[PDB]
Each structure stands twice: as structure tokens, then as C-alpha cells.
Design an enzyme around this catalytic site. Structure first.
Site, PDB file in Angstrom:
ATOM      1  N   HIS A 220       6.463  56.402  15.568  1.00 43.18           N
ATOM      2  CA  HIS A 220       6.396  55.864  16.762  1.00 43.18           C
ATOM      3  C   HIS A 220       4.667  56.856  17.379  1.00 43.18           C
ATOM      4  O   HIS A 220       4.536  57.157  16.916  1.00 43.18           O
ATOM      5  CB  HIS A 220       7.586  57.732  17.695  1.00 43.18           C
ATOM      6  CG  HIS A 220       9.176  56.448  17.230  1.00 43.18           C
ATOM      7  ND1 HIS A 220      10.328  57.715  17.368  1.00 43.18           N
ATOM      8  CD2 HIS A 220       9.492  55.124  16.724  1.00 43.18           C
ATOM      9  CE1 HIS A 220      11.258  56.375  16.625  1.00 43.18           C
ATOM     10  NE2 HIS A 220      10.673  55.997  16.467  1.00 43.18           N
TER      11      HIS A 220
ATOM     12  N   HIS B 133       5.592  60.529  11.995  1.00 41.37           N
ATOM     13  CA  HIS B 133       6.647  58.893  11.618  1.00 41.37           C
ATOM     14  C   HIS B 133       5.940  57.802  12.494  1.00 41.37           C
ATOM     15  O   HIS B 133       4.573  58.448  13.208  1.00 41.37           O
ATOM     16  CB  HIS B 133       8.346  59.111  11.786  1.00 41.37           C
ATOM     17  CG  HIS B 133       8.326  59.623  13.331  1.00 41.37           C
ATOM     18  ND1 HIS B 133       8.492  60.638  13.788  1.00 41.37           N
ATOM     19  CD2 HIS B 133       8.838  59.157  14.096  1.00 41.37           C
ATOM     20  CE1 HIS B 133       8.984  60.983  14.834  1.00 41.37           C
ATOM     21  NE2 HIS B 133       8.625  59.970  15.513  1.00 41.37           N
TER      22      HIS B 133
ATOM     23  N   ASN C 156      15.647  61.345  21.091  1.00 36.77           N
ATOM     24  CA  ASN C 156      15.637  59.059  21.244  1.00 36.77           C
ATOM     25  C   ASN C 156      15.730  58.959  19.955  1.00 36.77           C
ATOM     26  O   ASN C 156      15.019  59.279  18.892  1.00 36.77           O
ATOM     27  CB  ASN C 156      13.754  58.989  21.998  1.00 36.77           C
ATOM     28  CG  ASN C 156      14.124  57.300  21.909  1.00 36.77           C
ATOM     29  OD1 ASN C 156      15.444  56.940  21.268  1.00 36.77           O
ATOM     30  ND2 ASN C 156      12.981  56.769  22.883  1.00 36.77           N
TER      31      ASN C 156
ATOM     32  N   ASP D  42       4.365  59.277  20.207  1.00 40.54           N
ATOM     33  CA  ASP D  42       4.077  60.526  20.003  1.00 40.54           C
ATOM     34  C   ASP D  42       3.781  60.883  18.629  1.00 40.54           C
ATOM     35  O   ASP D  42       3.536  62.361  18.232  1.00 40.54           O
ATOM     36  CB  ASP D  42       5.951  61.323  20.311  1.00 40.54           C
ATOM     37  CG  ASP D  42       6.547  61.608  19.241  1.00 40.54           C
ATOM     38  OD1 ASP D  42       6.936  59.872  18.516  1.00 40.54           O
ATOM     39  OD2 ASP D  42       7.400  62.188  18.954  1.00 40.54           O
TER      40      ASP D  42
ATOM     41  N   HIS E 258      15.712  60.866  12.211  1.00 43.21           N
ATOM     42  CA  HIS E 258      15.416  61.157  13.585  1.00 43.21           C
ATOM     43  C   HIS E 258      14.404  58.967  13.131  1.00 43.21           C
ATOM     44  O   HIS E 258      15.061  58.576  13.873  1.00 43.21           O
ATOM     45  CB  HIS E 258      14.669  61.857  14.236  1.00 43.21           C
ATOM     46  CG  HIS E 258      13.419  61.242  15.230  1.00 43.21           C
ATOM     47  ND1 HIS E 258      13.851  61.059  16.227  1.00 43.21           N
ATOM     48  CD2 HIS E 258      12.152  60.658  14.893  1.00 43.21           C
ATOM     49  CE1 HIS E 258      12.677  60.239  17.109  1.00 43.21           C
ATOM     50  NE2 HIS E 258      12.030  59.931  16.247  1.00 43.21           N
TER      51      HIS E 258
END
Ligand SMILES: C[C@H](OC(=O)c1ccc(CN)cc1)c1cccc2c(-c3ccc(CS(C)(=O)=O)c(Cl)c3)c(C(=O)O)[nH]c12
Ligand SMILES: [Zn+2]
Ligand SMILES: [Zn+2]
Length: 232
Positions: free
Chosen positions: A87, A85, A181, A89, A150
Site C-alpha cells: 500500500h 506491504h 482499511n 503508506d 491486513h
């Protein structure tokens, strides 16, 4: 101890590998965000005499350290990477990868979201993943889009040789007490997306979350439970 390495055991900037199965490792690194320190996972899958990387190590210097650790421990070249995805990280470090010869991939949804957010952008688009339940092969793995969880773009990765399910950030570890998050999450769709994962991968033996300790298929039900309690 040989146990899975936890947030307090990894200084920010160092990377650990953990052997999951024959030809499958996780990578673990830690990063600071908004004044707290977090661990995060990715995956490495042996692809003949090359390696497939799933997700960066959450930052440029972490990802450089990842590449060094792979060279030390495995000694095969990383040739392709998939980010699951948008983000940091998952994509933070894509520029480091791209300068080290690695071809970087993500869905068009992920690429759009990364660009809009100002995060690093994988080079190549992965078609065939735009509708929930879609699956495509990518070297030694299957990529699966379960639906929004998420994030709206999250992908999960299955290693059929080893029955390893890498849930990424759509799956939480068993100790989790909240849903992480959630700023970009869909808490209402998340359980439905997890149910799709459970139905599609009933023979998974190891389940790896985006953050924290691997376990078995119980991680999926636990995730649904903590997300429902968060929505509530
Ligand atoms: C890098 C990632 O950025 C985002 O997501 C983000 C979202 C929106 C904006 C606004 N433009 C900016 C950044 C991130 C940054 C910092 C932390 C996380 C966590 C996380 C994981 C586990 C726990 C323990 S738990 C399950 O017990 O709650 C907690 Cl607390 C947090 C997760 C995750 O859940 O995947 N992603 C984390
Ligand atoms: Zn995320
Ligand atoms: Zn995450």
C-alpha cells in the site's frame, strides 16, 4: 509534551521522529486519502554508521521531508529501506528514496501486488519470506512473515537489540475501534497470523502499529479482538 505525536498534531507534509530505544526511532507523518486525514508510522534503525528505514512516509513529498528530518535529527545516511506491504503508506515515496541513494527492498509478493495496483515498486526482492513463520535477517532487524492479515504480503520487523516489535499494519493501536482499511485484508486468517507473532516474539517490550500509538504486547491481543469484531 514529548508524547507520541497524534494525527491532529502533524500537518500533512511534515514528518516527526520519536525515539523508541537506543538506535531505534519511529517516523510519523500524515496523509489525506478519500477525503480524510490519517497518521502513519514507520521505523528507523541504526546500522553502524548508516540507517535502515522501514516503510516510506506515505507519499513522495512526505518521504522527502522524512529524509530531511533524519538529516536534521540523526545525521547518518539512509542506505537501505524495506517496505512491509504494497500500500501507498509503505511504498509511496520509494521513487524519492531510490533517487536519494537508498536501495529499496520488499518481498516478491509485495513487489507483484504493488506493480499490479500501480503503486511504486521497490527495486530488490526479499526471498525467504514466502511461507508463514519464515524469518530472515536484514541488517540490525529480523523480518518475519506471519501470514495474511491486513494484507496477504504484510511483514513484521523485530529489532533484537532493543526488543522492539514493529507490527506494521497487521497490528492496531489500543484505541482502535475497527480494523482500519480492510479492503485487502483476510479477516479470517488475521487472528491466526497475530497468534504467530505472539508466539515468535514473546519478549517484545515495545509494539509499534502501522498507524497510531506504540504500546506493549497488549496491542497484539487487542488487534485480534477488533478484527474478530469486524468480521462479525
Ligand atoms: C494507504 C492505505 O490504503 C489502503 O489500505 C488501500 C486499500 C485498498 C485500495 C483499493 N485499491 C486502496 C488503498 C490506507 C488509506 C487510508 C486509511 C488507511 C488505514 C487506516 C488505519 C487506521 C484507521 C483507524 S481504526 C484502526 O480505528 O479503524 C483507519 Cl479508519 C484506516 C490503513 C490501515 O488500516 O493500515 N491503511 C490505510
Ligand atoms: Zn495497508
Ligand atoms: Zn496501513
Amino acid at each position: 509534551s514529548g508524547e507520541y505525536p497524534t494525527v491532529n498534531e502533524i500537518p500533512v507534509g511534515e514528518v516527526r521522529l520519536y525515539q523508541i530505544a537506543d538506535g531505534v526511532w519511529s517516523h510519523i507523518a500524515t496523509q489525506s486519502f478519500d477525503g480524510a486525514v490519517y497518521p502513519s508510522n514507520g521505523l528507523i534503525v541504526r546500522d553502524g554508521d548508516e540507517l535502515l528505514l522501514i516503510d516510506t512516509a506515505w507519499g513522495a513529498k512526505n518521504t522527502a521531508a522524512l529524509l530531511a528530518e533524519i538529516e536534521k535529527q540523526i545525521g547518518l545516511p539512509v542506505t537501505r529501506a524495506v517496505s512491509t506491504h504494497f500500500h501507498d503508506d509503505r511504498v509511496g515515496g520509494v521513487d524519492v528514496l531510490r533517487a536519494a541513494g537508498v536501495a529499496t527492498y520488499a518481498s516478491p509478493s509485495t513487489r507483484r501486488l504493488a506493480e499490479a495496483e500501480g503503486n511504486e515498486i521497490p527495486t530488490h526482492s526479499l526471498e525467504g519470506l514466502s511461507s508463514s513463520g519464515d524469518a530472515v535477517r536484514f541488517g540490525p532487524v529480523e523480518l518475519f512473515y506471519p501470514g495474511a492479515a491486513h494484507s496477504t504480503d504484510n511483514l513484521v520487523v523485530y529489532v533484537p537489540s532493543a526488543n522492539v516489535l514493529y507490527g506494521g499494519c497487521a497490528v492496531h493501536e489500543l484505541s482502535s475501534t475497527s480494523a482500519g482499511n480492510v479492503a485487502d485484508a483476510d479477516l479470517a486468517e488475521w487472528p491466526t497470523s497475530v497468534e504467530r507473532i505472539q508466539k515468535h516474539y514473546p519478549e517484545a517490550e515495545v509494539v509499534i502499529p502501522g498507524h497510531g500509538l506504540p504500546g506493549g504486547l497488549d496491542l497484539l491481543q487487542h488487534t485480534a479482538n477488533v478484527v474478530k469484531a469486524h468480521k462479525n
